[PDB]
């Protein structure tokens, strides 16, 4: 089109704070946090038996709580589960206009996003919803990274893409520990001395390139070690250096760390 | 894999009898016909205001009537409508195991079929349905025929593909109001005399090639003029010659005509 | 996208009148013709040594003549020629904003259109042109028909696509006579009796499908026999039936013929409106299907009737 | 690349005469025929128990017989059979330089041709063969026509592509009779009258488009009715009209019929020369517009004249 | 498919032990080794004049020796050589059912594997072979890594995919020394201090992603320095961390090292 | 094709020396340098108001100066600018046969190169230019790296491909300092200590793979810190290791540094010739593999040693 890359969404995304839908007592705290994006979770932080109740809890929270200027997103279950369709139907039929975004996990190709888009669009039209939802996806599988560009171009709704390093590692068969960060066995040996390198380099850089090509925000995923502030800082700094615009917080203390690294200047 | 093309489903598909879901009085008449496949319709034979009730009737018929050995299909609404998702959700959640198949209309690419497959599969798993549904699709748009092969390879559930000449003509901007058959203004002029040619040749042939490549049944669609048996025979014969295995009946009289042409 | 297929340009395109840019004495009459689109030619109707002058003539006509409500287009030389870049540079630098469109010949892939788009866009920006040109292309080669869909989706500027039967046949190695129309040696023999069929069926239909998929106007090309009005009517009727919206006029006589065919007859229109009324009545009765003159009509029939109507309301 | 479409091989291909490799007595007659291309068959005209012997026969025929100016091709068995690899290996290891080409049947995708190319290339290198083989392929399946362009672009060796109407119809599940030609049940009905149309239109046109896009010769396949001479002519004329350059002969009578349709008449050649001479004379006087008897000539009208003259000189 | 990614072959592949077919006196030591996979070589460890004899040796070895529970593979010559067809023809026509697998070198596209598949399938059918051969391929060229996913999906026979660092480096025009491992000239300079990084990161990660997407086993290739046990461990650990399941042994004492790193807990 | 990968152009490309077309007083110094390739710039080193003059300057320099055996290239403006078409038209219509190459910046897809190829080919035919121009491109955007293989295969004119790390970083939204090199915030933390890693790894390797697949020269782009020779050396050495054959010089002093790194050392070539000799001896006694200094060495090492020599 003889201008370069499309501009990404202008909204801040320095930090996405996650909380399980099964704990409504956390919602007001999340709303009061310094996080730019709130992720209410129906997926991995919620046991299968609790998913139906968590779904109801989230719908009530969306309709009943003051979320301020925060971007409100919900991580639904995967398309390889029986839960995902009910997540989408109930959310789009019952949740009010305050809902901003849906997060789709384990995306492995463009058609996965198209599928959710097909369903979401129909319900929006059926219910006469005035504010169209945006999409964000998680790259957390071999298929996801292998198909990262087609996924980035898969929907006009798409605004963000996250790397889920833990589930990515599991999918890739990576012999890693914890969630993200330095890996003990990934180092170069030179004259008896060890130098640790970045085992996530390609996955992060490819995600960034795919996102920037198609006007999407690339985002860094969870970091597991809550007691390692400097580990988080290093991980976030690497991601920012590679072009990512923010990082998940799965613990309240991580929000300040993410804001420290990702706030522009 | 260095073998011949995939084998198509072995089930009979000589004729598919259509009937609006808003006319439940037709259902037992359809069930008693000589049609191999029964298509209960929620789409273009049903007014928008009646689609919700038509859906309720179809579910009742699936759980209520004796369909014998018929292949029981339901044509849902298109993905560009607000009706399609409720069609699928209600059917898979409420209809018993007698439902065999759903027909997806106005398919423009493989992702459309993938989208329905995503939804259907999740509900089957959630409800523990023992008999997985098959799919059939209609090629009835410009995009459809342009992407016919990718559509033919779009799902393991896919068993059949029909050419819908009515919507196809509209989408293509074809100057006509008739449904299939001979076109008055499509002829060759040689030394004063006119010779009428087949305006549907490529569409049908492309569909057959796509279907045979991927082990799918290619089917001819609706013939509008139910007062013209010889017109129907001509259309059905052309389709058979091109490799299609059957044809829709949109009226009881057409069922006998279809079986005449397509019975091996 | 989950929407209707992209709507084509609403502008009329029933007839495209061609005229060599080397003959400016005809320009005035073309402007006063009944053609919806005017095509001033720099390509095959102009000898190589006459191209430079024809280029200057066309630019002068774009700036000087009153073209009324005509859609003004120029056919440039192909990307396989040394002429094309000078055609585009001179037109975009020297011609005023009355120029609407350029026609690109012998298009074989999406990249050909993109190449012209790249040049045109840079010059429009450099000169600050206020009305961006639209593109139309000619499918007149084997490569063209084989890659027809990618060509249809090659540029936001693209508004129309023509089948050039004479050059298509040459490229395909077709043993044909004249330009388009019935071919003597293309017939079916049944019981010693011959039945002529359409040797252009796939090319036309595939172009229509590609165009309609991407919101482009499919157009029929030149018909060579100027003395055969009924032959022209036959060719135009086949095109209109397959979905094409208009046809070239390479002779002033053909303009009236094109407009007659590609404007829906009064009989066809009245039938379309009755079907709409019949379907509208069935809706109020709570039915999506009913009977019209002994044949089935339904919701899909509404959209077919709407095809006939909007072309007549043009 | 900003030039005209790739030029096809500059050799005549009006008729390809087939003969089973199990019948070596026919070989000298084929070599003496008026066919441009000779196809010795290892495939469907040869029974499974005769395939090994036919392979030996063909190899001897290539090494021992005088084939004159004929383009010598061998149709091997398909990649879905246990025979194909043995066909290629024995041919490329044992046959002399006189072998020009191999024909690959039932090609469904580009990778089928690539597979054969990989094998053929390695044996040519191992044996030090001096004249590399060209390929030709048969489109005779649904997969083949669906993937026709990718097949056309599948190999630098590829020179020709045929439509096998009978096997194509069987693959497509077409309810047809015989091999090619008019089909009884494929007609248009108007006012009680029937008009028969072409049930092979797209298959033929698409093959021609794919071939001409990639510099390949598009060829029409077998016609079954050996007594229907006018049926053959009609089929050949349709093919010629759609852009095919030749047709198979599976019976010696068909050779004359094929050459008749695909050779320009002496009248057409003469008129073509005159038009080109008129143009040349005009340019000699520095004129851009040519005039022949009647009026003015379109550039496409001289384009075909040059094609016709080029044809006549290819047949010497 | 709305299911998890395809499961890889279940068989062990911690170590692949290579040996030139031109040295049949070493075959019994290989059969007795602790390697899961045995690779009898007809390619780059056999001089051109010795290839015909090595072929006969291997065929005799397949029919003659006790291979126990070893997965028995043969690396044939590449499709750019005149040797490959004779390698495959003789193996499939003359070797018994003890042969498990063929290793295809220098694969640059999916069509390369299809070509070998076409030939193997024909002979298996002609000879009525009871146990169909599996395939493994080596990614050891620029074309290979560029087309790694299409190669991973190239055949139902494909079970494993190896990175060949020696040929890869040559094909890529890498100014490297030795085979794999730390590269002296690949380091980051920070405040007059050198930090060596992984010059093989993308190639290894991309291979793992392609393999896991399509149910293939990703394998690390040869490590040249025999005398460097710690260097081997470092290379093996990096590979394991990135998701590879095993590594070649081109010297007998590398088998134990590979098993130490790749044996699952 | 069943052959080895296509061979790249054989011409030297150890260093590409850039100079703005707006400063013709520096041209003669460039022609006197030890740089293999000369890049006269119409793009980012030239302000918009100077572009037309620089165009005229460059044309005069091409027709007027002695460039010896240098490969003479001109970096035109991008396809997203109004300047590019006039750069091409003027150069191809007015510059003499001494011009060798045009460098296209910000290439995002194959069609970009095709667009320039279409224009260049037509003018060459119109003017009857006897020496067809080659192309080189810069991968300096997200789209460029995502589509890097299709770009590398986009034209028979294409001979070289550069990574432009600064503009790449900007497009990618990378939080980096300077141009290329070590990045302060890109490090691994292990028990309290930091280990810096390569934030350009995939970009460089992917460019090399795309290039080598299609017979193109992969080249490393600008390095910003002119006072940091060791910094330059580390960057050049990483690139050479990954397979890049040369590096830009944007300051005159960088030419020697590029030549030093991208001319294989006598130590490296002696070790290569030593390996080749060892494998001749191995092959002579019926061995496809042998031992070299406690290391494995076989037929694969031959092509490796040949890359060196
Ligand atoms: C072209 C685009 C498309 O989408 S077409 C695909 C979907 N279309 C349809 O489903 C249309 C099906 N057709 C119909 O709705 C009806 O046949 C139409 C055309 C409306 C005519 O209905 P009607 O006037 O009742 O027919 P008729 O009087 O001639 O009835 C004769 C006897 O047969 C029955 N009948 C009628 N239609 C069906 C049917 N589809 N299936 C089974 N039976 C049918 C009628 O009851 C009547 O029977 P009886 O003798 O009273 O027992
Ligand atoms: Cl994760
Ligand atoms: Cl034309
Ligand atoms: Cl046949
Ligand atoms: Cl830069
Ligand atoms: Mg997860
Ligand atoms: Mg319809
Ligand atoms: Mg033309
Ligand atoms: Mg056959
Ligand atoms: Mg190797
Ligand atoms: Mg730049």
Residue numbers in the entry:
A (entry chain E), E (entry chain D): 2 to 266
B (entry chain B): 2 to 265
C (entry chain A): 2 to 315
D (entry chain C): 2 to 317
F (entry chain F): 2 to 310
Give me lines lifted from the publication on this model.
Malyl-CoA lyase (MCL) is a promiscuous carbon-carbon bond lyase that catalyzes the reversible cleavage of structurally related Coenzyme A (CoA) thioesters. Malyl-CoA lyases are promiscuous enzymes that accept a variety of substrates and can catalyze the reversible aldol condensation of CoA thioesters like acetyl-CoA or propionyl-CoA with 2-oxoacids like glyoxylate or pyruvate. The two MCLs share the common fold of a central TIM-barrel with small elaborations, as well as an additional C-terminal domain. In both cases the oligomeric state constitutes a dimer of trimers.
The recombinant MCLR was also initially crystallized in the absence of substrates. The crystals grew in space group P 1 21 1 with one hexamer per AU. Diffraction of the crystals reached a resolution of 2.1 Å and the structure was solved by molecular replacement. Three of the six chains lacked electron density for the entire C-terminal lid domains and were modeled only to Pro265 or Ser266. For the other 3 chains it was possible to model the lid domains with the exception of only the terminal 1, 3, or 8 residues. Notably, of the three lid domains that could be modeled only two were in the closed conformation. Interestingly, in the two subunits where the lid domains were in the closed conformation, the active sites contained electron density that allowed modeling of glyoxylate molecules together with magnesium ions. Nevertheless, Mg2+ could also be fitted into the 4 open active sites, whereas glyoxylate was replaced by water molecules in these subunits. Although glyoxylate was not intentionally present, it was likely carried over from E. coli cell extracts during enzyme purification. Soaking of these crystals with propionyl-CoA resulted in the additional occupancy of one of the two closed active sites with the CoA thioester.
